Amino acid sequence: GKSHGYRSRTRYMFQRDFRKHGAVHLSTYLKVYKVGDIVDIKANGSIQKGMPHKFYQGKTGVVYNVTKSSVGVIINKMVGNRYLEKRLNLRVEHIKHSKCRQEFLERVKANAAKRAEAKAQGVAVQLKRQPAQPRESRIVSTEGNVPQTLAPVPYETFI
C-alpha cells in the first residue's frame, strides 16, 4: 500500500547540512521574538520536539504567540481555491527572523531622512523606487583600443 506518514518524503529536507551536525549554536537560543515579528520556517532535524510539518518548510509567517520554548506562527495555507489560517507551534530551533522586510525598513528610515533633508532645504524629493531604465547615449573611444576582428573557427576534434 501507499505510505503517507507525517515526515514522509523528507529524507533530504530535514537532513542536516554537510559538516554541520550536532549541538545547535547558542545564538539560536539567544535570539528574541515578539508578536508581529515575521519569521522564516526551517526544520532542524536534530530537534525532534516542536517540529514544523514538511509543508511549512521554507515558509514565512507572523508570530502570534510567545511561550516558554516556542513561538506560535500563523501561515496562510491555500487549500482548494482559497487560503485558510493555520497556526504553528514551533520551537525556536526551527524559526528565524526574516530579512524580507529589512530592505523595506531600511528604505523607510532612509525615506524619512531625505524627505526632511529636502523639505528643510527647498522641496524636490523623488522617493519611489524605479525599475532599471534603459541606458543612455555614450561615446566609446578607440584610443588604446582598436577593434579586434574575430571570425568563426574551423571544426576540429581533439580527443
Binding site: 559538516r19 547558542l26 539567544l30 521574538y33
Partner: protein
C-alpha cells in the same frame, strides 16, 4: 606519528571540527545551553550565572550574563583579592572559597542598590538557608551556579563559593546535600561541621594535629603560618574578621598597575614572532632547490 596510522585526504576533508571552546576542553555546551537560555516570554531578561572556577590555586567568581556577541561580566571577584581583607594564606581552600563568594555577593549587591536591604545572614552558624524576599520591596538578585566542569561531590568546595554568595545576600537556589557535613545515610546536615569548614576548622585541625605528631611536614607546608606566626586557633578569627572587612567595604580596588597598556604591548612584541611574506617563502623554496637538488 606511526606510518600505518596517519590521516588521509579523505579523513581530514570530511572532518567536522567540534566547536572550539570544546576542542579546548573548556566549555560543556550541553550545560551552557541549559544554563543560559531564557523563557521566551521574558524577552530581553538576562539570565545571570555565578561562575566559579578553580585555577591551580586562585578562585574566580564572576556574575556573568549572555549576549550573542559574547558574554558579560556584571561583577568579578578573585580570591587573590583576599589579602586586602586579612587573608594571606591558603587561598584555594574551602573557607577562601566561601569568603570570595561572600565578596562577590556583597560587591554586586552593592553596585545594584540592594545593598542595605538584603544583608543575608551576618551571624553564620552554617544553618541551611537561602535569602528570602522582603515583604513589599525588591525581590533579591537571583543567580545560578556555574560549576563548569567541576565534579559534583558532596564536600566539594565549589559549593563553598555558593554558600557565601548565598550567605552574602544573593538568591542562589540550592539544596543542602553537597555541603561538608551532609549525612549520606540520613537526609540530614550536621551544621557544626559546615560552620567548621566556613571558618577553616578542617585546616586548623590539621595544623594542630601535626604540631606534635610530625614537625617535618608541618614545617614544609604551613611554612608561611610559621613565618607570620599564626598557629592554628587564631585561624577562625582571621576569617571571622575577613567577613567583617569584606562586608564593611567590598567595592573592589583595581591594581595600581605601573607601566601603561602601551608598554606591556611593546615589550611583549619583542618575543612575538611574526609571519612571513610569500615572496620570502618563494625565496626559501628556490633556495632549497638550488641547494638540495643541484647535486650539492
Amino acid at each position: 606519528a606511526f606510518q600505518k596510522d596517519a590521516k588521509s585526504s579523505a579523513y581530514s576533508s570530511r572532518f567536522q571540527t567540534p566547536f572550539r571552546r570544546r576542542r579546548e576542553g573548556k566549555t560543556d555546551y550541553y550545560q551552557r545551553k541549559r544554563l543560559v537560555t531564557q523563557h521566551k516570554a521574558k524577552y530581553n531578561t538576562p539570565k545571570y550565572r555565578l561562575v566559579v572556577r578553580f585555577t591551580n590555586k586562585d578562585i574566580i567568581c564572576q556574575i556573568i550574563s549572555s549576549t550573542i556577541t559574547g558574554d558579560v561580566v556584571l561583577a568579578a571577584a578573585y580570591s587573590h583579592e583576599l589579602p586586602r581583607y586579612g587573608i594571606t594564606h591558603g587561598l584555594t581552600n574551602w573557607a577562601a572559597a566561601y569568603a570570595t563568594g561572600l565578596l562577590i555577593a556583597r560587591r554586586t549587591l552593592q553596585k545594584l542598590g540592594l545593598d542595605e536591604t538584603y544583608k543575608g545572614v551576618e551571624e553564620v552558624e552554617g544553618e541551611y538557608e537561602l535569602t528570602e524576599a522582603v515583604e513589599d520591596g525588591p525581590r533579591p538578585f537571583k543567580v545560578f551556579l556555574d560549576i563548569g566542569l567541576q565534579r559534583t561531590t558532596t564536600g566539594a568546595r565549589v559549593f563553598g563559593a555558593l554558600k557565601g554568595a548565598s550567605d552574602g545576600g544573593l538568591y542562589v537556589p540550592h539544596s543542602e546535600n553537597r555541603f561538608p557535613g551532609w549525612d549520606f545515610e540520613t537526609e540530614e546536615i550536621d551544621p557544626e561541621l559546615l560552620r567548621s569548614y566556613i571558618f577553616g576548622g578542617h585546616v586548623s585541625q590539621y595544623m594542630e594535629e601535626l604540631a606534635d605528631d610530625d614537625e617535618e611536614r608541618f614545617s614544609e607546608l604551613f611554612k608561611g603560618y610559621l613565618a607570620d606566626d599564626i598557629d592554628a586557633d587564631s585561624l577562625e578569627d582571621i576569617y571571622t574578621s575577613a567577613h567583617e572587612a569584606i562586608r564593611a567595604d567590598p567595592a573592589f580596588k583595581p591594581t595600581e598597575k605601573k607601566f601603561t597598556k602601551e608598554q606591556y604591548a611593546a615589550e611583549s612584541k619583542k618575543y612575538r614572532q611574526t609571519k612571513l611574506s610569500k615572496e620570502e617563502r618563494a625565496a626559501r623554496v628556490a633556495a632549497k632547490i638550488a641547494a638540495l637538488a643541484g647535486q650539492q
